[PDB]
Amino acid sequence: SMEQVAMELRLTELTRLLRSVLDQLQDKDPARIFAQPVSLKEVPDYLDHIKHPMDFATMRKRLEAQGYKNLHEFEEDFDLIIDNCMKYNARDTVFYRAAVRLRDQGGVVLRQARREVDSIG
């Protein structure tokens, strides 16, 4: 139907805007700490600690399959990246500190993304 196409165009355009948001958030991680999944070869106990691992490559795979229906879903995954790190790693670590900086810097980006998602519909 024409309605299904219109909905699909909206989803495509959201995917466009979330791709730009993803690029901007990932620039706030220049050390690439959050670029890839935590390696279960290198951190064999990880899933005992963290039940829903997340990372920017895994988000990008979902994004490109148009798997985020709304900004809330995308933000859920971004928060998992930060929150998982802040639990597994101690406060005095470069990992934790990276996550704090990413959260703080990403907040700005996500604040305007919400306005654009509402504004453009």
UniProtKB/Swiss-Prot annotation:
Tissue specificity comment: Highly expressed in testis.
Subcellular location: Nucleus; Chromosome
Location of cross-link Glycyl lysine isopeptide (Lys-Gly) (interchain with G-Cter in SUMO2): K41
Superkingdom, taxonomy of origin: Eukaryota
Chain ranges of the Bromo domain: 9-113
Biological role stated in the UniProt entry: Scaffold subunit of various histone acetyltransferase (HAT) complexes, such as the MOZ/MORF and HBO1 complexes, that acts as a regulator of hematopoiesis. Plays a key role in HBO1 complex by directing KAT7/HBO1 specificity towards histone H3 'Lys-14' acetylation (H3K14ac), thereby promoting erythroid differentiation.
Assembly and interaction partners: Component of some HBO1 complex composed of KAT7/HBO1, MEAF6, ING4 and BRD1/BRPF2. Component of the MOZ/MORF complex composed at least of ING5, KAT6A, KAT6B, MEAF6 and one of BRPF1, BRD1/BRPF2 and BRPF3. Interacts (via PHD-type zinc finger domain) with unmodified histone H3. Interacts (via PWWP domain) with dimethylated and trimethylated 'Lys-79' on histone H3.
Protein name: Bromodomain-containing protein 1
Organism from which the protein derives: Homo sapiens (Human)
Whole-protein coverage range: 555 to 674 of 1058
